[PDB]
Symmetry: C3
Subunit: 488 residues, 3 copies
């Protein structure tokens, strides 16, 4: 006698996308999203961090007071940007452990300088050189004081400067290395000099070395740069019989979030939390392949250039109606799961809202349950190097390589696990909907094996509606259905 | 009347607790346990490790033999505890690479010192100073020998000490830095001194520095400390024409589990494997947020202060009997899963032991399948710093920060995966029990859709017992049930 | 008979193997595979990397040109192997920061040397020593030039060498430390010498130290070794008034994949991508416990000595036919899942190929979806050390320990997760095959509860085949089966 068909199904799209799971090398899903940020605009955004463009100046030359760097006096920054075109244009110098001086100043974030009056009676102050023109005059580093003989004498200097405040003082000083003995004795009378800078807890003595170095900006002489931090209640003592390059005061040294970066990218007007030497990048994705060098709230650097996170179910092409065993339904556009029927009123279709929402709710914000937010990092270690150095650089490189391989592994496993779970939970909602419909129908229907029920009674549009609504009363139809099912 | 109802259910509690899974931001379960240790008693337990309280003494001052540290002569430790109140009270000194000498002695774990007879003929031994009082006498570091002129002469010292033993020897020696030339020549005759300590394979030469330093305990002079390790079959040679602070012998240097920690926590009578600067902590949990500085068998340091691991099923409160589709049963207190029935004898309930034990067995020891035990660590790297240093300290901080972010990621993912699996395995035990009952019943029952069966025959308490027992014989009742189901 | 029995089952084996999952401490499976490489052949394979056996020579003695290392002149390598028997046989020397010099040369991969003509007019070249015989003559390091007085004079040397090419130059030079003043003035006329080597960007000054060191190969004198790298467009300048040990030219310095390893394993004819100090190892497994020191494309080092990855389903001993609810089938040796039946023509067994392939396809290459290939590492950090050093060595050890604990955790979790997924997916294929058969049979069969169906009609060998085929037409038999099922 009289029967009807009720099929259960899920949607499908014509333009699917491939992802990887624990189970499958490649499986097509209806939708996915990229987790690796792989592009930049190429500009460093000037908000929200305070960006200071070094332009023609390294941080160290701005510290010492090279004349063409005079504009940087007493400046501050969150990120100091060093350019590849920068150059020195003052007295030729070197800094033992230059990388550490550059690092601790960059981290402090300020060039604020406070003058102090040392008692330099007995010597002449403010020596200058034609290698260090300020305007048209011979000059010198603005923060250093080149001392030399007065009236053919250089007495032994022995000078003190207490730290009577609440904060550490950073003192920058140096030692002059003459090219010849005639140069040495013309300036310091004595044939050999000595420079001792000490505190209660520390001391440094340096003896200059007389001899020719290769000509730089007209000079074979050199200055070596040193530094001393004086804690509150300690005392700076400077002791010299010649060749001392005196400080003119101290730098205020702070703690905080400041750092330094080498980059030639232009600075632009926008805001962006994450900065790389390539420019700023968005941080909406958890991973990035733009540059292992970062500043700010940044995605984690990984080796992969793409990781696709599934955001929808398996995509299965559409092969009497038929249900989910065979294929997906490209014609279902207003839900993820639903019903099709054929009965005496024709054929029709309707979406299931609840099962659709359950799948969307589980997929929404899935990655955040494991990586909630991006970590902010500020001053770190250097990661590129322009000179061969051996033991310490080997270690710096190994530390960073180790870190990147472990985060790359985490990223790969996370995406495969999460995608496996997306397939499993969207399959599971389909099955739950089918089973729920099966128990509603009791003895009034049989499973045809293709995702559909043969309903063994007349079942018009209202009857199909009551099943979708969950209000179908199997008792109303059981007598008719048993009669149809169990005849012979 | 002619039928009975049999429902399958699981327990529920009135006081559930919220956890995170791969699927859900927050889901209530019946029971959970804390995986981050976040408190301490505040005292360092004196068992099972040998604790040595430095009291007023740094390890380096106990090594050198500052008089107020004389009680530490020949001591040993598993963990040396350095107090912030410690102070020096002898000749003012510094140590180039101070951190490395503190580290290597801390790691060796002993101050065992062995006297040797160096041949100091030609000079006076045992110089002392009012800056270094031992009792009522001017004195000096007990393990060092301050040499100076005898009868207004200081010959070139040239002395040897072979290592004819089976163990490395550690020699601590020094160089005296006078304040003035009058001081220098009064002690050492020459206007300039020199100290060279060498082995077959290594050498160190130090030239003293004459000049004024700030007064510490009455003195502007200083000593610098140096060290030399001599291997079996090697030879120590000490060569000096002035300013040498000689060793009196060597320290035995061992390898093993000893270390050093900065802490102001009191030492108490108790036992604990894990020590932090805050006090000892339990190690029953896998992670801790008390301090990244630890010694012994310790939980792993993470940034989270709470991680909740589910130890029970989803909690669904109890809102005609009904089964697990609707809700959980708070009235079920002797098992996790069970049966309720309604029949001609009224209503009853009983727990299923086998499904209950299977869920408990899977949850028991769950975390230990991945992290079995806690790692024991001894001497590590420093992780707090009182001075600005630049490159090397940047690297130490970055190594530790990298480590903590990776373990913190591991802890978050592990708790999310494990909790998802606890929900899944406990849902699965409920489903398996329902299906097993479904198949026992054959054609004698229908599923009502709510976790219950309508049994289509008289089924008294003994009859319900036979289903729970697994001994129900469907054939005994089939005729009666088919007649009631199909009215045939 | 008027009925038949069709059971569904999976295979089992008599020799199972134990593995660990997220759920089970130990569960027996049909097959597993070892993921930790723990053995080696003990020989270093000479393909595909260029191996250079140091034999009696350290890399550094081969660089300087110790006469018994003359054979290594201008040599090159991918991996330089240093032997524990190596010895020095020339002038006794030391290298401040020896480890960095060894590291940067090992990394460069070449001893290619280019003689340059320095202007030493005014002094005598090519000093030699009976501690350094070449043949029967007193001699010296081949790449160094021992300068000394000519005609009782030693003028101040001031000598230049530009880099006018496109590649960096590495210069090795030294300073002679005499034992006595008579030696010093006999060689260099002056009572004290000094050596300054400088570029536009750097300077190094070393003052020699006169005094006795312990006798080595007849001499209490020593040479100290130093190095300088010169960039294109820079200039080397050597300035000395005595004690200079001059370079004879430069070493070409390259970048690439080269390194150095300490090992006493013999070199043999074979190929292997991965080298350890124990010998070469296979790299087909993802992890290894042979040695944390490796070179090339190697498995990752872990602490575990065994990790078993399941490659088959749960193994259940075979306890009239019965299906999968009870046990596995040891007698099914041609498939993983299958059918057993009893019907009017007898009893039989047949494998189901499609479900067997689905499980095998999912297990095949499962580990590669997460760790696709082996990482190639070349020059890294040192990981064993023969001298006590303190801070830097503490950090090298801690970096390596940290890495190994994180990877050992990654390995443990991966194996437990994957094994859980292998159990789950093979359980699932069995269930899917049972449900597929249930739905083919419609009203013609009942589930007996033990993994078998009672089919309520005559069902000969062809009929059973149509069920295994997916082509069974339930309508053909429905009248006969309903009559048999339903009767009072
Ligand atoms: C030791 O040797 C070096 C180099 O052999 C001498 O340095 C050289 O000094 C001369 C004159 O002082 C420099 O010449 C100048 O060159 C510039 C630029 O081309 C030009 O503007 C001048 O008019 C003059 O010709 C030469 O550049 C410089 N070479 C180097 C490499 O620095 C040094 O003077 C010698 N020292 C002693 C004490 O003899
Ligand atoms: C180089 O300059 C320093 C700094 O001015 C001189 O140091 C000072 O030396 C005097 C003694 O000559 C010390 O004074 C003493 O103070 C204590 C009280 O705390 C007092 O009882 C003593 O009776 C005397 O007043 C003073 O503390 C010290 N200051 C510092 C910072 O070291 C040093 O003497 C000069 N050296 C030469 C060689 O000229
Ligand atoms: C290599 O180094 C030597 C040593 O400095 C250089 O030789 C010296 O060269 C100068 C200039 O050619 C000579 O000066 C000349 O001396 C004669 C009389 O001695 C004088 O009449 C000339 O007017 C000029 O002053 C100097 O004598 C000579 N010294 C020696 C010991 O030979 C040589 O130039 C350097 N080679 C190169 C390519 O630069
Ligand atoms: C400073 O003291 C050292 C330590 O005693 C002196 O070194 C010793 O010097 C003697 C003679 O110069 C060396 O003697 C030789 O020993 C070898 C080894 O068997 C033997 O074959 C020779 O025939 C000769 O007897 C002795 O080895 C050496 N010992 C060491 C450890 O270097 C050094 O001479 C003293 N310096 C001065 C300037 O007096
Ligand atoms: C395909 O997946 C993406 C990623 O989840 C969906 O885009 C999200 O849409 C919601 C609501 O519109 C936004 O709140 C998210 O910010 C979007 N995420 C991204 C990364 O764009 C997208 O809607 C899905 N497409 C379809 C047709 O459902
Ligand atoms: C950075 O330095 C360059 C080099 O000195 C400067 O460029 C010169 O500027 C002067 C003054 O305007 C001109 O006379 C020269 O012709 C320029 N030379 C070149 C090669 O361009 C430049 O002005 C500096 N920039 C900043 C921002 O300070
Ligand atoms: C961002 O900048 C980095 C640094 O220069 C780029 O990396 C270089 O890429 C070139 C060619 O792609 C290689 O030859 C270099 O070896 C790379 N250098 C380093 C240090 O890796 C990178 O490609 C840039 N990325 C983007 C997205 O602009
Ligand atoms: C809630 O979960 C905790 C954690 O598993 C249970 O505590 C365990 O109880 C057993 C028996 O009392 C002890 O042997 C274990 O050592 C305990 N483990 C921990 C971590 O404390 C607790 O029993 C559970 N509560 C209920 C009501 O089931
Ligand atoms: C254990 O000791 C550490 C170190 O003192 C404590 O960490 C400090 O906590 C205070 C208060 O939150 C902060 O202001 C400091 O900046 C922290 N110092 C460091 C170095 O992190 C920690 O709170 C203590 N923990 C317990 C449980 O007592
Ligand atoms: C047991 O498992 C191992 C590991 O998967 C199987 O060995 C693989 O067999 C295939 C085909 O013979 C080869 O291509 C692979 O190279 C083998 N891998 C390893 C690691 O040996 C083995 O076939 C399985 N044994 C049985 C009886 O099923
Ligand atoms: C590979 O070589 C290393 C280094 O010798 C071996 O590790 C040593 O193992 C012995 C075991 O008798 C220990 O006593 C040593 O302390 C270990 N040394 C180090 C540095 O770890 C390792 O066992 C060897 N492995 C194989 C498979 O040959
Ligand atoms: C498929 O095309 C639609 C329509 O343009 C688009 O909205 C959707 O994001 C696409 N999805 C994929 C996975 O390409
Ligand atoms: C709930 O209360 C019981 C009764 O004392 C207690 O034993 C149990 O541990 C509590 N559990 C939670 C999650 O609060
Ligand atoms: C530590 O030093 C202070 C100050 O001299 C003293 O009063 C105290 O007794 C000392 N403590 C110990 C344990 O020696
Ligand atoms: C120490 O050396 C001197 C020679 O400088 C010698 O006379 C003396 O006997 C040696 N031994 C001693 C003093 O025990
Ligand atoms: C069991 O034995 C067979 C045949 O000898 C062998 O091929 C197989 O690898 C063994 N499996 C296990 C898990 O031992
Ligand atoms: C290494 O040195 C020993 C000792 O001189 C010598 O007998 C041997 O021949 C040398 N071997 C090689 C390979 O040079």
């Amino acid at each position: 006698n009289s029967t009807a068909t009720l099929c259960l199904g899920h949607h499908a799209v014509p333009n699917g996308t491939l992802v990887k799971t624990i189970t499958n090398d490649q499986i097509e899903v209806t939708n996915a999203t990229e987790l690796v940020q792989s592009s930049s605009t190429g500009r460093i955004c000037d908000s929200p961090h305070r960006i200071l463009d070094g332009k023609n100046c390294t941080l160290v030359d701005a510290l010492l007071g090279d004349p063409h760097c005079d504009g940087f006096q007493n400046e501050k920054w969150d990120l100091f940007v060093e350019r590849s075109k920068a150059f020195s244009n003052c007295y030729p110098y070197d800094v033992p452990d230059y990388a550490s001086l550059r690092s601790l100043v960059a981290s402090s974030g300020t060039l604020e300088f406070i003058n102090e009056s040392f008692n330099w009676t007995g010597v002449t102050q403010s020596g200058g050189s034609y290698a260090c023109k300020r305007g048209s005059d011979n000059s010198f580093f603005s923060r250093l004081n080149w001392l030399y003989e007065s009236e053919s004498k250089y007495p032994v200097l022995n000078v003190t400067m207490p730290n009577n405040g609440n904060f550490d003082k950073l003192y920058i000083w140096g030692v002059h290395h003459p090219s010849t003995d005639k140069e040495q004795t013309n300036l310091y009378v004595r044939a050999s000099g000595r420079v001792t800078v000490s505190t209660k807890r520390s001391q440094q003595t340096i003896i200059p070395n007389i001899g020719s170095r290769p000509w730089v900006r007209g000079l074979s002489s050199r200055i070596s740069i040193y530094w001393t931090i004086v804690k509150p209640g300690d005392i700076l003592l400077i002791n010299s019989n010649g060749n001392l390059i005196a400080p003119r005061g101290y730098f205020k040294i702070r703690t905080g979030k400041s750092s330094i970066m080498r980059s030639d990218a232009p600075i632009g007007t926008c805001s962006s939390e994450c900065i790389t030497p390539n420019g700023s990048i968005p941080n909406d994705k958890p991973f990035q392949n733009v540059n292992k060098i970062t500043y700010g709230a940044c995605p984690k650097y990984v080796k992969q250039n793409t990781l696709k996170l599934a955001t929808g179910m398996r995509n299965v092409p559409e092969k009497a109606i038929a249900g989910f065993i065979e294929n997906g339904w490209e014609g279902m556009v207003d839900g993820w799961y639903g019903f099709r029927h054929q009965n005496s009123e024709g054929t029709g279709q309707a979406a299931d809202l609840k099962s659709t929402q359950a799948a969307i709710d589980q997929i929404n914000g899935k990655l955040n349950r494991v990586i909630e937010k991006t970590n902010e990092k500020f001053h770190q270690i250097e990661k590129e190097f322009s000179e061969v150095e051996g033991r310490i650089q080997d270690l710096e490189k190994y530390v960073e390589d180790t870190k990147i391989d472990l985060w790359s592994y985490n990223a790969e496993l996370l995406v495969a696990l999460e995608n496996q779970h997306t397939i499993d939970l969207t399959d599971s909602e389909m099955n739950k909907l089918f089973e729920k419909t099966r128990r509603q129908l009791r003895e009034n229907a049989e499973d045809m094996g293709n995702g559909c029920f043969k309903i063994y009674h007349k079942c018009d549009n209202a009857c199909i509606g009551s099943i979708r609504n969950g209000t179908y009363d199997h008792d109303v139809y059981r007598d008719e259905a048993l009669n149809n099912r169990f005849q012979i």
